Write a protein that binds this ligand. Structure first.
Ligand SMILES: CCCOc1ccc(C[C@@H](Cc2ccccc2)C(=O)O)cc1CNC(=O)c1ccc(-c2ncccn2)cc1
Lengths: 260, 263
């Protein structure tokens, strides 16, 4: 039966490659050197960044910290569509109750967003605009409160997550496992969701044993990261609320706010 | 093989220690709850008068809801002591840096407390006073705010956790796994903790495979429960903060205070 789990693993990797333009392998090459990205490490470099390279998530449409924070939201929305497309390639997903598909994505995309963002981070900063740029951790941390601490929690997670040394083929299955979570609020038919996830989990276990035979209990260690992920998401929602209640300079064009 | 042999010996050691440390097992709780016998019937507390007769029938201020809350504190402290005793039996634990031993218990005890409290619960209520009593979930909800909803999320977790149908032999290893968590804040020496947990995880994996061979991915499902646990603790802390502000006349136990401090 093992043949089916390997076919699924390959299937998911291929789809993952199709859906996500910037892979972990590509991002690592850039991050470590082997090539080159424009570095944003302060206000002047940010501005040159905008001018020479035109980071579309920083395009016109104000205060720097606010525009950066909004740029994050813009890219996040963009990423949701890549994930949605990936989801439809997971065997069984499209066959689920349509409301459940919506629910699974609604609750799953944030977890997936921060998982994949780790692929774009090291302890020193993060790749932006399709790897064209690299924004430093310290520059982000330097932003005025409450924006100074907005990315930092993701960096902390990424550093820990990245120590697992997962590759794209590992991540493709993990992301699938995240989407097929049977505990999302408001699901109408949990059974086929858990059944698909049980299959993904089997596929994930084998992939990790085959791909990382030396890494004892990697499967267990990866599953444990779900705690870290959800905590990051919860924490992000909490900040969004704060800045929405306080902060008076956040508004965009009403259609832009609707979109994002 | 020799490797599996060592993991089985580990599982046996932990189960043995668990039975030695925890006076009310899940096996006994279930026997009491399934109410199949004549010697183990609990007195059921479901309102005020039946409460008032409890204090007479069962052997354990002049207020009401504080009494239940403080009875619950006392039990929690007792549970910490049982769990601390169990921890010492986990191979390698007492050999760790002393500061890390404290840290591991500080963050681990409540996750374990709610994990094990599930054993004493069904959708209708919870065993109390070493199984001699049973307090209904509805009664607990009938309590004045903020007390009125301290337990509900525990009940919610329990019903879904209990669907895994774990037994004590499984639980002994799982709680060991929880304690030996290398990602507790402020740990000095993460590696030796992680090394211990890895072997515990191996033992847990094998245990579930042998004990529930028909239960697909039970190992993974169990591990995902650890985020449910973290979240219950999170809620409980905030609920406590609210209490400390509305109920200035209510004492909290010093041990519990220290555990929650800067958590
Ligand atoms: C009683 C309902 C649920 O039980 C909980 C619930 C939670 C915990 C752990 C929790 C306790 C706590 C309370 C307040 C502040 C801080 C902690 C925790 O430590 O987080 C234990 C327990 C265990 N409690 C008991 O066995 C128990 C013992 C005695 C009584 C009781 N005694 C007299 C009159 C009525 N009831 C009730 C309950």
């Amino acid at each position: 039966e093992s043949a089916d789990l390997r076919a699924l693993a390959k299937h998911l990797y291929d789809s993952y490659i199709k859906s996500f333009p910037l892979t972990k392998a590509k991002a690592r090459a850039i991050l470590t050197g082997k090539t080159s990205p424009f570095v944003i490490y302060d206000m002047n470099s940010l501005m040159m960044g905008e001018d020479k390279i035109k980071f579309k998530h920083i395009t016109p449409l104000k205060e720097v910290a606010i525009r950066i924070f909004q740029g994050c939201q813009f890219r996040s929305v963009e990423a949701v569509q890549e994930i949605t497309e990936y989801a439809k390639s997971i065997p069984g997903f499209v066959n689920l109750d349509l409301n459940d598909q919506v629910t699974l994505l609604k609750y799953g995309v944030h977890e997936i967003i921060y998982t994949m963002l780790a692929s774009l981070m090291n302890k020193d900063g993060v790749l932006i605009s399709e790897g064209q740029g690299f924004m430093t951790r310290e520059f982000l941390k330097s932003l005025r409160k409450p924006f100074g601490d907005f990315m930092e929690p993701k960096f902390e997670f990424a550093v820990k997550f990245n120590a697992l040394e997962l590759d794209d083929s590992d991540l493709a299955i993990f992301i699938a496992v995240i989407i097929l979570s049977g505990d999302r609020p408001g699901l109408l038919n949990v059974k086929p969701i858990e059944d698909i996830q049980d299959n993904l989990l089997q596929a994930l276990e084998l992939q990790l044993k085959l791909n990382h035979p030396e890494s004892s209990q990697l499967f267990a260690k990866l599953l444990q990261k779900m705690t870290d992920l959800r905590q990051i998401v919860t924490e992000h929602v909490q900040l969004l609320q704060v800045i929405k209640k306080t902060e008076t300079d956040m508004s965009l064009h009403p259609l832009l706010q609707e979109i994002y």
